[PDB]
Amino acid sequence: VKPNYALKFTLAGHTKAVSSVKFSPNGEWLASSSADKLIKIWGAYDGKFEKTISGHKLGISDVAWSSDSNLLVSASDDKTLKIWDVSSGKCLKTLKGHSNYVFCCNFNPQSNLIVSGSFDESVRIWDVKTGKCLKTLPAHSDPVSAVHFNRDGSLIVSSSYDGLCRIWDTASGQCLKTLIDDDNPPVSFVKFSPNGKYILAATLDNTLKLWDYSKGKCLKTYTGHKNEKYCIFANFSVTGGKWIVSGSEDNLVYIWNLQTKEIVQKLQGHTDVVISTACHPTENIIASAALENDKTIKLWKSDC
């Protein structure tokens, strides 16, 4: 079986390249971050603009929701992360500690911690309540492209332009594993699978790979798209058919069958690199965002 995603809405608003889009865990909203220093909230089902959240001094590279859909955390070129209360729009805390651009961020499952990756080549773990840095991990030898907590939050996976994917013990900060294949291209994105058994990793050699974390080996590879310059997000679509979703440097959204690795659909419409995609938690809905020459977000819907 194959999906039939069709364009339903195009969201205009950001004045510069959009950097990331994420659906709230409760499925009510879509948050977007942009090089325009802003975060915008949109209705997940109707694509209707809700509000703008401002505060950062420079462009934003990533934004993420807390487990209860009440908070957001953003990573910016101003070298800070900001925790926001979505309902009030207030900046609850500004996390200062990184010495260079903050590139990626995420809350842990209980949302009491935030993990961040920066151009300073480190990974930091922060306490949400106090906004204080708990640990600084000398994780890589190049910018950290992504950071993500596993299902129970005991592990953190990080990726970097240095070509490595490393898994860290949240409590001790010890490097528990370094994953790399036969080549050393920059690793542009990583994240644990929904069940926490795998790690989906993107490398700047036009490849996505599904790794078995425990065994430390590559199980599947997804190819066919273009990705050699930007850190494009990738997702696990689990509402209908089990797919792998990702933007591409040819302005398209690619969708692969996770098990067979075959391309099942390509979404056309954006006018620039699709830097970020996200899959709704309960409906077969995909949100995609593009760079500078496009500046829009698109919502696609499928029956399966």
Binding site: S20, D77, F103
Partner: peptide, 9 residues
């Protein structure tokens, strides 16, 4: 405008 929207060598 932001690191992610730029190319890194």
């Amino acid at each position: 405008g932001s690191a992610r929207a730029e190319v890194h060598l």
